[PDB]
Amino acid sequence: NAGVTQTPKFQVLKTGQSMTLQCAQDMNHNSMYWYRQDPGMGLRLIYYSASEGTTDKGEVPNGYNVSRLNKREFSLRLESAAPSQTSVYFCASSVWTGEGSGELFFGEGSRLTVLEDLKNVFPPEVAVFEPSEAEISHTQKATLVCLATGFYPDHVELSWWVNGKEVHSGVCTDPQPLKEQPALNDSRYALSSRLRVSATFWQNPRNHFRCQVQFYGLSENDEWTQDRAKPVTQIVSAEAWGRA
Amino acid sequence: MIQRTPKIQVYSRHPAENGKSNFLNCYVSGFHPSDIEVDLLKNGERIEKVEHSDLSFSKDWSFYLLYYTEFTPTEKDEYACRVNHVTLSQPKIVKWDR
Amino acid sequence: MRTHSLRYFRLGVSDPIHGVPEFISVGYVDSHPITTYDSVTRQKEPRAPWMAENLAPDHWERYTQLLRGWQQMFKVELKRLQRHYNHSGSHTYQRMIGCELLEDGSTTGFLQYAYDGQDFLIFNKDTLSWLAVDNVAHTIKQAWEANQHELLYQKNWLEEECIAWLKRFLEYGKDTLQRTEPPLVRVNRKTALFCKAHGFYPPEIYMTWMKNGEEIVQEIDYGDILPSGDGTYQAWASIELDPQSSNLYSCHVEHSGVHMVLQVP
Amino acid sequence: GQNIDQPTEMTATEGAIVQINCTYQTSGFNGLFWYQQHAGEAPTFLSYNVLDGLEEKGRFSSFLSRSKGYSYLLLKELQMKDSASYLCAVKDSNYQLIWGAGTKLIIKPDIQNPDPAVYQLRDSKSSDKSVCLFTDFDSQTNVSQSKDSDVYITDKCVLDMRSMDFKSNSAVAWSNKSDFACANAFNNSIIPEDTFFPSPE
Ligand SMILES: *[C@@H](C)/C=N/c1c(NCCCCCO)[nH]c(=O)[nH]c1=O
């Protein structure tokens, strides 16, 4: 009952690198599709497979190929990645062909960034800032802030952990990152998140707070030649304790 | 399972006049299921160079085909159409009646 | 214009003999085949030159993909019917969909299915429901009618899309489809009078016999309208002569708005 | 060619009604779809129309006029969870889906007791940044991006404290410049006249 399972969620590539995106559906659907989604335009079909045993080009096939490996699986290949292929890729499936009233079922999406040089890739710095005492006395509430700054590309997941458990109530994380230099096309990014709790919860000294950012970056086979540390996929975090 | 036997009609393209080139048609229709064998005969022998339309579909779910060959009718030569189908015990022969 | 129609047929065979296709689909405008696909070629191809000349390769390529999907769907449905029927051996499944644009401007649209050459499910696009002929069909009717959006989609296709396609193909093929070749009609004796017509297009023709100005349809033998092979058609009708009393017999032919009377002296 | 148009963005208030329009010009018509796409997530099917009229599904209804080539998705009793992009798509005569670019729907929370204020968060011993929080303001307030290249200001974000059924807007500003101060951080925004600025030092 998984629906449409596609991988990877994030991937950084250098121009010329090869990449395969995987997609499987367990719904016994006959038709499968690969779409790309870009700002300011509607979804564009790259390739599709009307049925097991056949495939054909969509609207934007150049630079891609597909394989309908079986009834379940439909993979997308970038043999030689180009920067223009930086996009969010969605696999989808439908019961029968594109023909009729049947809707599409989408996978969770794959974010690809293709770069001329990996020297632009940076993990985030993460810092946590404890609540204002003035806020506590004026509102009986306490807002912590987490800042994840200087990262590139925008492949991050930020989470809050209270007392060893991930929380989402009381959390607001910016839905889009901030360009630290809005004019540069490859600007590094910043992202802020807030966790707001009652003053009583913040004033318990045994309560523990952590902001954690998963960064998706380079891997073992990426070549690195810079003086700084290789920006591999990694988790960066910062913490705070409550205070009486 | 209702199987329907073919209706077989044999006729010339134009009203036939001896010595004038014509086409001999065999129109096989109304049959089901679709597999069928059709030969045009001349003096009882199978004509070799014989054309035919693709299998065609009728609204009543039956099928039809047209088999045809160019010929020049003479007073001596007799022509027929021979059809086999799952509904026929032996092949059915229909002679051209001009 | 005269009345015209567009229709698409599908045939599926569950256990075909060697060579014969598991699946065939053919389109027609009036009596003219326009498109063909089968499980051996796996390609949708024109069957009329005026279709090939007016539809770019992207058309044939796209519908080739849809037809490969429709082929598989037809196999699944036939396999399911043959289970419900608990039938062994080879069985056939057929579909026909289409529309007519009538002379007066009105339209019709239809969609139906057959199992072993007999009506199985018939769509009513006005009540948005399927007529089932037996209990296997009734089970399918329930599944199809649960999908109300698909019923609406079929009504829209029959009433709007099909008519738009037909008008597009009628223009593509207008030199063939909209021409008139009048019949050549003669009477001869063989004892019965035969009224014979040939060389005419379109194939729709009305031939009958009258006796002293009255039509006795119960004693008339009507021949089929048959293809002559050159794009035109031929037909006939006969009536048996009374050898004990003279009568004024006349053959009446109507074709494409013109009436003809041949009186037998 | 063929094209489909819908507004880039719409903003409405919580509890209210919004109508998202979609107009299309296509070669044939085999039905119109609406999908919802929350930010960072997959689109999910909402509705299908192919004949004329209005169809209802909970708080959402979808209308179609084939002759006008128009549809709208109608959302009643707006909730914060309706914040998402809404994608129209039309199947043309060859069953190709033509996708609109999507309408981003932003929902303004109903702030029961606005208490606008700018607070100085405590410094982190691991960061050179000073951090200010503008919070608890009414939803008509807009937060402008910064004009100093070494000051960073994020857009407002709606937080829900579910245990207290309490929603609040906030925006964050930070800098490592020595002349940065919370009293001036949001100077480029139009902030409420009664915004509370607690004393420093
Ligand atoms: C090329 C246009 C071939 N089309 C075709 C079709 N088209 C009809 C699709 C109708 C949708 C509503 O059911 N049908 C068919 O059976 N065979 C074809 O070859």
Q: Is residue C145 domain-shared with residue C201, that is, in the same domain? A: no
Q: What is the DSSP string of D132-148?
A: EEEES--TT--PPPPSS
Q: What's the CATH number where C256 sits?
A: 2.60.40.10
Q: Name the residue with tokens 């039956």.
A: B62
Backbone angles phi, psi at D154, to 5 degrees: -90, 160
CB D171 within 8 A of CB D153: yes
CB A34 within 8 A of CB A48: yes
What is the domain count for chain C?
2
Strands D53-57 and D32-37: unpaired
Q: Is residue D160 domain-shared with residue D100, that is, in the same domain? A: no
Question: Separation of C27 CA from ligand 1 center, angstroms?
Answer: 8
C-alpha separations of C119 from A187, B60, D126, D197 in Å: 67, 8, 80, 82
Q: What's the CATH number where C81 sits?
A: 3.30.500.10
CB A55 within 8 A of CB A64: no
What is the domain count for chain B?
1
Tokens of A5: 């399972």
Backbone angles phi, psi at A198, to 5 degrees: -65, 155
Q: Give the list of residues 6+ apart from residue C181 with CB closer than 8 angstroms, or none.
A: C199, C200, C201, C232
User: How far is the C-alpha of D184 from the C-alpha of D201, rounded, in Å?
Assistant: 15
Q: Is residue C149 domain-shared with residue C65, that is, in the same domain? A: yes
The residue ranges of every structural domain in chain A are: 1-116, 117-244
Q: Which residues of B touch C13 (CB under 8 A)?
A: 33-34
Q: Which residues of A touch C77 (CB under 8 A)?
A: none
Q: Is residue D129 domain-shared with residue D187, that is, in the same domain? A: yes
**Which among D91, D109, D127 is the end of a domain?**
D109
Using CA positions, which residue lies closest to atom 2 of ligand 1?
A: C63
What is the residue type of A178?
Answer: L
Q: Is residue D5 domain-shared with residue D64, that is, in the same domain? A: yes
Strands (E), chain A: 4-7, 10-14, 19-25, 31-37, 44-51, 54-57, 65-68, 74-78, 87-94, 105-106, 110-115, 125-129, 141-151, 156-162, 165-167, 171-173, 178-179, 189-198, 208-215, 234-241
Tokens of B9: 């009609």
Q: Is residue C219 domain-shared with residue C256, that is, in the same domain? A: yes
User: How far is the C-alpha of A219 from the C-alpha of A201, rounded, in Å?
Assistant: 40
CB D191 within 8 A of CB D133: no
Backbone angles phi, psi at D188, to 5 degrees: -85, 0
User: How far is the C-alpha of B67 from the C-alpha of B56, rounded, in Å?
Assistant: 12
Strands B7-12 and B22-31: antiparallel
User: How far is the C-alpha of D62 from the C-alpha of D87, rounded, in Å?
Assistant: 13
User: How far is the C-alpha of A153 from the C-alpha of A159, rounded, in Å?
Assistant: 18
- After which residues are there C–N gaps above 2.5 Å in chain A? none
How far is Cα of residue C169 from the mean position of the Cα atoms in its chain? 16
Tokens of D61: 């209804």
Question: Separation of C174 CA from ligand 1 center, angstroms?
Answer: 21
Q: Is residue D6 domain-shared with residue D62, that is, in the same domain? A: yes
User: How far is the C-alpha of D184 from the C-alpha of A192, rounded, in Å?
Assistant: 20
Q: Name the residue with tokens 């007392």.
A: A163
Q: What is the number of other CB atoms lying within 10 angstroms of the CB of residue C26? A: 20
- After which residues are there C–N gaps above 2.5 Å in chain C? 190
Domain ranges, residue B82: 1-98
**Which among D109, D142, D174 is the end of a domain?**
D109
Q: What is the resolution of the experimental data for this entry, in Å?
A: 1.8
Way the structure was solved: X-ray
Max Cα–Cα distance, chain A, nearest Å: 68
C164–D31: do the CB atoms touch at under 8 Å?
no
Tokens of C239: 């009536």
Domain ranges, residue D152: 110-201
**Which among C146, C161, C179 is the end of a domain?**
C179
Closest-CA distance, A70 to chain C, in angstroms, reads 14
CB C33 within 8 A of CB C27: yes
Helix (H, G, I), strand (E, B) or coil at B59: coil
What is the domain count for chain D?
2
CB B33 within 8 A of CB C117: yes
Q: Is residue D176 domain-shared with residue D158, that is, in the same domain? A: yes
Domain ranges, residue C213: 180-264
The distance in angstroms from the start CA to the end CA of chain C is: 37
CB A148 within 8 A of CB A190: yes
Listed residue (C18, A172, C249) closest to D159, CA to CA: A172
Q: What angle do CA C62, C64, C68 make, to 5 degrees?
A: 120
Listed residue (A224, A36, A3, A222) closest to A112, CA to CA: A36
**Which among D109, D133, D150 is the end of a domain?**
D109
What is the residue type of D140?
Answer: Q
Q: Is residue C218 domain-shared with residue C192, that is, in the same domain? A: yes
Residues 150-189 of C with CB under 8 A from A: 150, 152-153
Measured from CB, residues less than 6 Å from any atom of ligand 1 are A 99; C 8, 10, 25, 27, 35, 37, 44, 63, 67, 97, 154, 157
Strands (E), D38-96: 44-49, 53-57, 60-65, 70-75, 84-91
Backbone angles phi, psi at C158, to 5 degrees: -60, -45
C228–B14: do the CB atoms touch at under 8 Å?
yes
Q: What's the CATH number where B77 sits?
A: 2.60.40.10
Q: Is residue C63 domain-shared with residue C87, that is, in the same domain? A: yes
Nearest to C68 among A50, A98, A101 (CB): A50
The 8-class DSSP code of residue D69 comes to: T
Q: Which fold has domain A1-116?
A: Immunoglobulin-like (2.60.40)
Cα atoms found within 13 Å of the Cα of residue C220, Cβ hemisphere only: 20
Cα atoms found within 13 Å of the Cα of residue C33, Cβ hemisphere only: 18
How far is Cα of residue A135 from the mean position of the Cα atoms in its chain? 33
How far is Cα of residue D148 from the mean position of the Cα atoms in its chain? 26
CB C3 within 8 A of CB C100: yes
Q: Which residues of C touch A31 (CB under 8 A)?
A: 69
